[PDB]
Design a protein around this nucleic acid. Structure first.
Ligand SMILES: NC(=[NH2+])NCCC[C@H](N)C(=O)O
Ligand SMILES: [Mg+2]
Ligand SMILES: [Mg+2]
Ligand SMILES: [Mg+2]
Ligand SMILES: [Mg+2]
Ligand SMILES: [Mg+2]
Ligand SMILES: [Mg+2]
Ligand SMILES: [Mg+2]
Ligand SMILES: [Mg+2]
Ligand SMILES: [Mg+2]
Ligand SMILES: [Mg+2]
Ligand SMILES: [Mg+2]
Ligand SMILES: [Mg+2]
Ligand SMILES: [Mg+2]
Ligand SMILES: [Mg+2]
Ligand SMILES: [Mg+2]
Ligand SMILES: [Mg+2]
Ligand SMILES: [Mg+2]
Ligand SMILES: [Mg+2]
Ligand SMILES: [Mg+2]
Ligand SMILES: [Mg+2]
Ligand SMILES: [Mg+2]
Ligand SMILES: [Mg+2]
Ligand SMILES: [Mg+2]
Ligand SMILES: [Mg+2]
Ligand SMILES: [Mg+2]
Ligand SMILES: [Mg+2]
Ligand SMILES: [Mg+2]
Ligand SMILES: [Mg+2]
Ligand SMILES: [Mg+2]
Ligand SMILES: [Mg+2]
Ligand SMILES: [Mg+2]
Ligand SMILES: [Mg+2]
Ligand SMILES: [Mg+2]
Ligand SMILES: [Mg+2]
Ligand SMILES: [Mg+2]
Ligand SMILES: [Mg+2]
Ligand SMILES: [Mg+2]
Ligand SMILES: [Mg+2]
Ligand SMILES: [Mg+2]
Ligand SMILES: [Mg+2]
Ligand SMILES: [Mg+2]
Ligand SMILES: [Mg+2]
Ligand SMILES: [Mg+2]
Ligand SMILES: [Mg+2]
Ligand SMILES: [Mg+2]
Ligand SMILES: [Mg+2]
Ligand SMILES: [Mg+2]
Ligand SMILES: [Mg+2]
Ligand SMILES: [Mg+2]
Ligand SMILES: [Mg+2]
Ligand SMILES: [Mg+2]
Ligand SMILES: [Mg+2]
Ligand SMILES: [Mg+2]
Ligand SMILES: [Mg+2]
Ligand SMILES: [Mg+2]
Ligand SMILES: [Mg+2]
Ligand SMILES: [Mg+2]
Ligand SMILES: [Mg+2]
Ligand SMILES: [Mg+2]
Ligand SMILES: [Mg+2]
Ligand SMILES: [Mg+2]
Ligand SMILES: [Mg+2]
Ligand SMILES: [Mg+2]
Ligand SMILES: [Mg+2]
Ligand SMILES: [Mg+2]
Ligand SMILES: [Mg+2]
Ligand SMILES: [Mg+2]
Ligand SMILES: [Mg+2]
Ligand SMILES: [Mg+2]
Ligand SMILES: [Mg+2]
Ligand SMILES: [Mg+2]
Ligand SMILES: [Mg+2]
Ligand SMILES: [Mg+2]
Ligand SMILES: [Mg+2]
Ligand SMILES: [Mg+2]
Ligand SMILES: [Mg+2]
Ligand SMILES: [Mg+2]
Ligand SMILES: [Mg+2]
Ligand SMILES: [Mg+2]
Ligand SMILES: [Mg+2]
Ligand SMILES: [Mg+2]
Ligand SMILES: [Mg+2]
Ligand SMILES: [Mg+2]
Ligand SMILES: [Mg+2]
Ligand SMILES: [Mg+2]
Ligand SMILES: [Mg+2]
Ligand SMILES: [Mg+2]
Ligand SMILES: [Mg+2]
Ligand SMILES: [Mg+2]
Ligand SMILES: [Mg+2]
Ligand SMILES: [Mg+2]
Ligand SMILES: [Mg+2]
Ligand SMILES: [Mg+2]
Ligand SMILES: [Mg+2]
Ligand SMILES: [Mg+2]
Ligand SMILES: [Mg+2]
Ligand SMILES: [Mg+2]
Ligand SMILES: [Mg+2]
Ligand SMILES: [Mg+2]
Ligand SMILES: [Mg+2]
Ligand SMILES: [Mg+2]
Ligand SMILES: [Mg+2]
Ligand SMILES: [Mg+2]
Ligand SMILES: [Mg+2]
Ligand SMILES: [Mg+2]
Ligand SMILES: [Mg+2]
Ligand SMILES: [Mg+2]
Ligand SMILES: [Mg+2]
Ligand SMILES: [Mg+2]
Ligand SMILES: [Mg+2]
Ligand SMILES: [Mg+2]
Ligand SMILES: [Mg+2]
Ligand SMILES: [Mg+2]
Ligand SMILES: [Mg+2]
Ligand SMILES: [Mg+2]
Ligand SMILES: [Mg+2]
Ligand SMILES: [Mg+2]
Ligand SMILES: [Mg+2]
Ligand SMILES: [Mg+2]
Ligand SMILES: [Mg+2]
Ligand SMILES: [Mg+2]
Ligand SMILES: [Mg+2]
Ligand SMILES: [Mg+2]
Ligand SMILES: [Mg+2]
Ligand SMILES: [Mg+2]
Ligand SMILES: [Mg+2]
Ligand SMILES: [Mg+2]
Ligand SMILES: [Mg+2]
Ligand SMILES: [Mg+2]
Ligand SMILES: [Mg+2]
Ligand SMILES: [Mg+2]
Ligand SMILES: [Mg+2]
Ligand SMILES: [Mg+2]
Ligand SMILES: [Mg+2]
Ligand SMILES: [Mg+2]
Ligand SMILES: [Mg+2]
Ligand SMILES: [Mg+2]
Ligand SMILES: [Mg+2]
Ligand SMILES: [Mg+2]
Ligand SMILES: [Mg+2]
Ligand SMILES: [Mg+2]
Ligand SMILES: [Mg+2]
Ligand SMILES: [Mg+2]
Ligand SMILES: [Mg+2]
Ligand SMILES: [Mg+2]
Ligand SMILES: [Mg+2]
Ligand SMILES: [Mg+2]
Ligand SMILES: [Mg+2]
Ligand SMILES: [Mg+2]
Ligand SMILES: [Mg+2]
Ligand SMILES: [Mg+2]
Ligand SMILES: [Mg+2]
Ligand SMILES: [Mg+2]
Ligand SMILES: [Mg+2]
Ligand SMILES: [Mg+2]
Ligand SMILES: [Mg+2]
Ligand SMILES: [Mg+2]
Ligand SMILES: [Mg+2]
Ligand SMILES: [Mg+2]
Ligand SMILES: [Mg+2]
Ligand SMILES: [Mg+2]
Ligand SMILES: [Mg+2]
Ligand SMILES: [Mg+2]
Ligand SMILES: [Mg+2]
Ligand SMILES: [Mg+2]
Ligand SMILES: [Mg+2]
Ligand SMILES: [Mg+2]
Ligand SMILES: [Mg+2]
Ligand SMILES: [Mg+2]
Ligand SMILES: [Mg+2]
Ligand SMILES: [Mg+2]
Ligand SMILES: [Mg+2]
Ligand SMILES: [Mg+2]
Ligand SMILES: [Mg+2]
Ligand SMILES: [Mg+2]
Ligand SMILES: [Mg+2]
Ligand SMILES: [Mg+2]
Ligand SMILES: [Mg+2]
Ligand SMILES: [Mg+2]
Ligand SMILES: [Mg+2]
Ligand SMILES: [Mg+2]
Ligand SMILES: [Mg+2]
Ligand SMILES: [Mg+2]
Ligand SMILES: [Zn+2]
Lengths: 112, 154, 101, 116, 59, 140
RNA sequence: GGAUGACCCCAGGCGGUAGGGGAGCGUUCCCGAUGCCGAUGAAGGCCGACCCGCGAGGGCGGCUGGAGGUAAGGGAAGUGC
RNA sequence: GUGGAGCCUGGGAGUGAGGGCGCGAGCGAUAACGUCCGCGUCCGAGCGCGGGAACAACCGAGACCGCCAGCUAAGGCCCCC
RNA sequence: CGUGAGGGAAAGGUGAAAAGAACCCCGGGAGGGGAGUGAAAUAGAGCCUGAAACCGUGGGCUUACAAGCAGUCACGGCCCCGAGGGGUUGUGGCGUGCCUAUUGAAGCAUGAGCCGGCGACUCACGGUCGUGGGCGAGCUUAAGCCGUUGAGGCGGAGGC
């Protein structure tokens, strides 16, 4: 049995959040929580939220035990980019891409 | 490219922009531009020689006759404009609808009765033509229709 | 006992029970054919000059087939020359029955 | 009537890309680089089918040479002798005999020495 | 200067190889001797406000 | 029938005395042994030659005026980094390198060729530390 | 040969740019079609180490898809990147 | 002398920047990877194959496809080979 | 966008029916997990199908003494599907991208970041050859007119 959560259209660059998600892949829920809590990255806030949403799903929907939970899989996908004009010298206009992330956390139970 | 709605303006200078040269955005190389050698209104008719089509007419009827699929009739019994009536007559005439029939008669009442049948094509003899003959498995004609036909191919 | 036989312009070491693919032979499936012998070995050695007079190998033709397609493809640069040919080599499959010395 | 590209180009590009599976980076992912890679691939295959025949003959010859020198003669003498003796066993089978049937090969060597 | 520019697009391989040094190292944590919570060493415990076996902070 | 390919074989250790032999003409034979081209099952893409032990490499011989006119050369990559060492000096300093260089130059380039060179053990003086492999003495 | 592109046998030719000629494949549309295939699954998509074809391609099978597609034989072009 | 020989009529072209080499001359300096003609050749179009370390035109040779068969060419046969 | 004359886009599709997801759960919200609707929910409104470039997660093979137009030929190793095949690639052989332009290009000469879609030899009238038919010292109609309503015929002026 697995439980899963997805935070879609999170306004943060995927390459940035992945760095954080890599920190918790395969960790027990408790270990992940401690890591995210003292990870000094903006992305920690978002991955924490998804992590917890997945833990709640596990316990409340899927009859899983909180003390058995671990991050069985996790990944970040790119959402649609928000394109924005960045005015440059000599009348040039560049396009900034403010990128977007779909954050998936999947929890399983580590038996015994 | 001359008939499309855009202006004839050169979209950017010939040289020194670092881009490909262009005139107006109506050029067919542009999405939304004119089309090159696209279709224009066209008359596909041409005058096929009279003797060829008269000959064709005779040959088309001849093909059906050689197959035993040409039948002439004097009259159409009791068909006065009702499909049910033509059906009754057709059954006796050996037309069970298992074969498509080109029915050629000057009798309007007969043509009206048969015209809605899927297996029947109806024509006045002045309209006899080889496409309609070759389209259909059987040819059925009035003695009257047979006569204007023989006049036509004479 | 093994023999070195000659068929389809090539030479093979055959033994009873060997299944072998050779160039296509003009012979019905199920027919048996006799292959020239160049040399015999195993227990006795006899050396052909070039072929040995008495001997033959008896083979049953199992059937004929077409080899797995090979793509023979030709290209010349800057000259717009491209050629694509599919090639399937025909063959006969043989089952070696006996070595008649 | 209009006949837009529709389906046809995608299908052609897919044929090429399927043949290019296994190739490095864009050579298996980009239609253009795949097509270029394949041009060269086909020419090599043709050239190397030819070359494969030479490759193996050279290998047989080397093995035959080593087997001969164990019996006191070199390859070029051995081949002359075989010619004079009228023995026509090819290099592919000579090399096999040299490894799998040393008694028979040694016999062939004798005939070759004698024939000279 | 004369505006140096990349000669070739960086390949997926080379791009990803440059990043072989980019993975984060996890925060280093120890248990707080008082409340057993994980926290960075040599910092005041944010959970109970203890440090050096005494209360330092309202938490 | 496919051409025979050998399963891995216990390599044969061989012992050679270099004393009085002509440098280049001995090298060609060591190379052949290294490649394993003397064996009927020779296969070009595996290391299956002999291990060759050589002794008295310091007593290798050479014709003409090569002792003083043959120059070994090394390039350091630095300006003026071309080093020139005559045969006499090489023999008087690292004698075993003379044969080593001669043979290395006679092996195929590439990974296999480099691996083959490692199967050559050249010693100045009459002794080698390889009694454990019991090298078979070879006249060549 | 056999009589006629029925297929077999013998022989010889078959590198190729500009370029000439020949034979084909596929795309859109019309006749064939008031038909026929189609929810027991159209077109399109994704696989395939299978079948046919020299090849361009064509089948077939699995998955997807969910409403169209269209033969032999011919016709016409906004027809292949 | 039956050849992808020739001649006649007609349809369709492309080409009208050549280049190396050998031989024969002119120009140049008994210079030029020079230049301009003549006879031939090859590359062009055979940047397909072997040799010449590598290399359009030097030597060998005109590649329909396949073969883990044989004989040769030039060139080679101490090792790399 | 331009002072102005003027220039001038992009942007279509849930489903048969909104039945457009009550209510509970994590979350500030967004978003999601259940429940529920539906034949179908990777048809959930950022909605038919959903290619390709491009990004990621998981797995198999493989890689830190190696010289490379990236392939190809051979063999061996491992994995997979069950005298066979598929994947991978250690070693050995061979190997100068594509297109354009040129006497000559891998060329350190042009062009191209990559992918998808748009993108260039046509049509009318006349000519000239060839060709499939019709008729043949003759062949043929044009505009029109009648008919048809995807029917064909008449029309000889005129042309050769
Ligand atoms: N007079 C006639 N029957 N004319 C031909 C038929 C008319 C019409 N197109 C039909 O099929 O119903
Ligand atoms: Mg940190
Ligand atoms: Mg909880
Ligand atoms: Mg700035
Ligand atoms: Mg401005
Ligand atoms: Mg500006
Ligand atoms: Mg400004
Ligand atoms: Mg960018
Ligand atoms: Mg940007
Ligand atoms: Mg215009
Ligand atoms: Mg205009
Ligand atoms: Mg306009
Ligand atoms: Mg306008
Ligand atoms: Mg306008
Ligand atoms: Mg204008
Ligand atoms: Mg204008
Ligand atoms: Mg203007
Ligand atoms: Mg311009
Ligand atoms: Mg310019
Ligand atoms: Mg630019
Ligand atoms: Mg441009
Ligand atoms: Mg540009
Ligand atoms: Mg323009
Ligand atoms: Mg303009
Ligand atoms: Mg315009
Ligand atoms: Mg537009
Ligand atoms: Mg338009
Ligand atoms: Mg156009
Ligand atoms: Mg035009
Ligand atoms: Mg135009
Ligand atoms: Mg009109
Ligand atoms: Mg026309
Ligand atoms: Mg007209
Ligand atoms: Mg009707
Ligand atoms: Mg009807
Ligand atoms: Mg009908
Ligand atoms: Mg009708
Ligand atoms: Mg034979
Ligand atoms: Mg067996
Ligand atoms: Mg075969
Ligand atoms: Mg065969
Ligand atoms: Mg190809
Ligand atoms: Mg090119
Ligand atoms: Mg090339
Ligand atoms: Mg070329
Ligand atoms: Mg080209
Ligand atoms: Mg060229
Ligand atoms: Mg080409
Ligand atoms: Mg197109
Ligand atoms: Mg299209
Ligand atoms: Mg397409
Ligand atoms: Mg294409
Ligand atoms: Mg497709
Ligand atoms: Mg295709
Ligand atoms: Mg690969
Ligand atoms: Mg790739
Ligand atoms: Mg890659
Ligand atoms: Mg890709
Ligand atoms: Mg070949
Ligand atoms: Mg070759
Ligand atoms: Mg050969
Ligand atoms: Mg000897
Ligand atoms: Mg000979
Ligand atoms: Mg021979
Ligand atoms: Mg400066
Ligand atoms: Mg400067
Ligand atoms: Mg600078
Ligand atoms: Mg400055
Ligand atoms: Mg700069
Ligand atoms: Mg640059
Ligand atoms: Mg990657
Ligand atoms: Mg890098
Ligand atoms: Mg508290
Ligand atoms: Mg020896
Ligand atoms: Mg010497
Ligand atoms: Mg020393
Ligand atoms: Mg070497
Ligand atoms: Mg080499
Ligand atoms: Mg040709
Ligand atoms: Mg022809
Ligand atoms: Mg067609
Ligand atoms: Mg097509
Ligand atoms: Mg239409
Ligand atoms: Mg219809
Ligand atoms: Mg229909
Ligand atoms: Mg049905
Ligand atoms: Mg289905
Ligand atoms: Mg369609
Ligand atoms: Mg297919
Ligand atoms: Mg389908
Ligand atoms: Mg419909
Ligand atoms: Mg279709
Ligand atoms: Mg159709
Ligand atoms: Mg058809
Ligand atoms: Mg038709
Ligand atoms: Mg049209
Ligand atoms: Mg077009
Ligand atoms: Mg003739
Ligand atoms: Mg000719
Ligand atoms: Mg000629
Ligand atoms: Mg022509
Ligand atoms: Mg023409
Ligand atoms: Mg010209
Ligand atoms: Mg001209
Ligand atoms: Mg001129
Ligand atoms: Mg000129
Ligand atoms: Mg010139
Ligand atoms: Mg000239
Ligand atoms: Mg000139
Ligand atoms: Mg000359
Ligand atoms: Mg001379
Ligand atoms: Mg001269
Ligand atoms: Mg002169
Ligand atoms: Mg010159
Ligand atoms: Mg000169
Ligand atoms: Mg001169
Ligand atoms: Mg010349
Ligand atoms: Mg040219
Ligand atoms: Mg040549
Ligand atoms: Mg030529
Ligand atoms: Mg060349
Ligand atoms: Mg070559
Ligand atoms: Mg050459
Ligand atoms: Mg060469
Ligand atoms: Mg060479
Ligand atoms: Mg050269
Ligand atoms: Mg040159
Ligand atoms: Mg050449
Ligand atoms: Mg030829
Ligand atoms: Mg020979
Ligand atoms: Mg010679
Ligand atoms: Mg040499
Ligand atoms: Mg050798
Ligand atoms: Mg203004
Ligand atoms: Mg304004
Ligand atoms: Mg304007
Ligand atoms: Mg809808
Ligand atoms: Mg709707
Ligand atoms: Mg429905
Ligand atoms: Mg809340
Ligand atoms: Mg809450
Ligand atoms: Mg919500
Ligand atoms: Mg959730
Ligand atoms: Mg939900
Ligand atoms: Mg339900
Ligand atoms: Mg259903
Ligand atoms: Mg379905
Ligand atoms: Mg779906
Ligand atoms: Mg759907
Ligand atoms: Mg629909
Ligand atoms: Mg969708
Ligand atoms: Mg999507
Ligand atoms: Mg991976
Ligand atoms: Mg090393
Ligand atoms: Mg290693
Ligand atoms: Mg390789
Ligand atoms: Mg091999
Ligand atoms: Mg395998
Ligand atoms: Mg492979
Ligand atoms: Mg393999
Ligand atoms: Mg080899
Ligand atoms: Mg290269
Ligand atoms: Mg080159
Ligand atoms: Mg190309
Ligand atoms: Mg270009
Ligand atoms: Mg140019
Ligand atoms: Mg130029
Ligand atoms: Mg030039
Ligand atoms: Mg290059
Ligand atoms: Mg370059
Ligand atoms: Mg330039
Ligand atoms: Mg370039
Ligand atoms: Mg230019
Ligand atoms: Mg660009
Ligand atoms: Mg790309
Ligand atoms: Mg495209
Ligand atoms: Mg034209
Ligand atoms: Mg037009
Ligand atoms: Mg026209
Ligand atoms: Mg004409
Ligand atoms: Mg005509
Ligand atoms: Mg006529
Ligand atoms: Mg007339
Ligand atoms: Mg006139
Ligand atoms: Zn604490």
């Amino acid at each position: 049995m697995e439980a899963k959560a997805i935070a879609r259209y999170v306004r943060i660059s995927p390459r940035k959040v992945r760095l954080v998600v890599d920190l918790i892949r395969g960790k027990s829920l408790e270990e992940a929580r401690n890591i995210l809590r003292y990870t000094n990255k903006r992305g920690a806030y978002f991955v924490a939220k998804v992590l917890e949403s997945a833990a709640a799903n596990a316990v409340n929907n899927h009859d899983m035990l909180e003390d058995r939970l671990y991050v069985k899989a996790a990944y970040v996908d790119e959402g649609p980019a928000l394109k924005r004009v960045l005015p440059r010298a000599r009348g040039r206009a560049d396009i900034i891409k403010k990128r977007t992330s779909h954050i998936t956390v999947i929890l399983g139970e580590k038996h015994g | 490219r001359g008939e499309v709605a855009y202006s004839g303006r050169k979209i950017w200078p010939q040289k020194h922009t670092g881009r490909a040269r262009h005139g107006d955005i109506g050029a067919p190389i542009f999405v939304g531009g004119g089309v090159v050698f696209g279709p224009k209104p066209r008359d596909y008719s041409y005058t096929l020689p009279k003797k060829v089509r008269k000959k064709g007419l005779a040959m088309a009827v001849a093909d059906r006759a050689r197959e035993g699929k040409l039948l002439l009739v004097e009259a159409f019994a009791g068909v006065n404009g009702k499909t049910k009536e033509f059906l009754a007559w057709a059954k006796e005439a050996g037309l069970d609808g298992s074969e498509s029939v080109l029915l050629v008669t000057g009798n309007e009442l007969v043509r009206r009765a048969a015209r809605n049948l899927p297996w029947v094509v109806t024509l006045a003899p002045e309209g006899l033509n080889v496409y309609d003959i070759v389209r259909t498995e059987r040819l059925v004609m009035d003695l009257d229709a047979w006569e204007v036909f023989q006049n036509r191919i004479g | 006992m093994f023999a070195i036989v000659k068929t389809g312009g090539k030479q093979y070491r055959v033994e009873p029970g060997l299944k072998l693919r050779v160039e296509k032979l003009d012979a019905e499936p199920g027919a048996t054919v006799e292959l020239p012998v160049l040399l015999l070995g195993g227990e006795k050695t006899v050396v052909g000059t070039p072929v040995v007079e008495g001997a033959s190998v008896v083979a049953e033709v199992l059937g004929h087939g077409r080899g797995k397609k090979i793509l023979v493809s030709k290209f010349k640069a800057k000259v717009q020359y491209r050629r694509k040919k599919g090639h399937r080599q025909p063959y006969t499959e043989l089952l070696i029955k006996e070595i008649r010395g | 009537p209009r006949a837009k590209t529709g389906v046809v180009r995608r299908r052609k590009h897919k044929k090429i890309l399927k043949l290019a599976k296994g190739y490095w980076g864009l050579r298996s992912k980009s239609f253009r680089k795949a097509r270029e890679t394949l041009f060269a691939a086909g020419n090599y295959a043709y050239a190397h089918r030819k070359r494969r025949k030479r490759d193996f003959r050279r290998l047989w010859i080397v093995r035959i040479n080593a087997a001969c020198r164990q019996h006191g003669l070199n390859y070029s003498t051995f081949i002359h002798g075989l010619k004079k003796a009228g023995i026509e066993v090819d290099r592919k089978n000579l090399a096999d005999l040299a490894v799998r049937e040393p008694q028979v090969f040694a016999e062939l060597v004798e005939r070759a020495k004698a024939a000279q | 200067a004369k505006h140096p520019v990349p000669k070739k697009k960086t390949s997926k391989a080379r791009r990803d190889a440059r990043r072989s040094h980019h993975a984060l190292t996890p925060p280093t944590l120890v248990p707080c001797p008082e409340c057993k919570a994980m926290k960075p060493p040599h910092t005041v415990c944010p959970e109970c406000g203890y440090y050096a076996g005494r209360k330092v902070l309202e938490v | 029938m496919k051409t025979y390919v050998p399963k891995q074989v216990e390599p044969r250790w061989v012992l050679i005395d270099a004393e009085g032999k002509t440098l280049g003409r001995l090298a060609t034979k060591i190379a052949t042994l290294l490649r394993g081209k003397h064996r009927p099952d020779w296969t070009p893409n595996v290391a299956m030659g002999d291990f060759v032990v050589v002794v008295n490499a310091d007593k290798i011989r050479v014709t003409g005026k090569k002792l003083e006119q043959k120059i070994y050369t090394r390039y350091s990559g630095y300006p003026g980094g071309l080093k020139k060492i005559p045969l006499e000096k090489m023999l008087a300093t690292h004698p075993e390198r003379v044969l080593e260089h001669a043979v290395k130059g006679m092996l195929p380039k590439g990974p296999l060729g480099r691996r083959l060179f490692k199967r050559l053990k050249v010693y100045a003086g009459p002794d080698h530390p390889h009694q454990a492999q019991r090298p078979e003495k070879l006249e060549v």
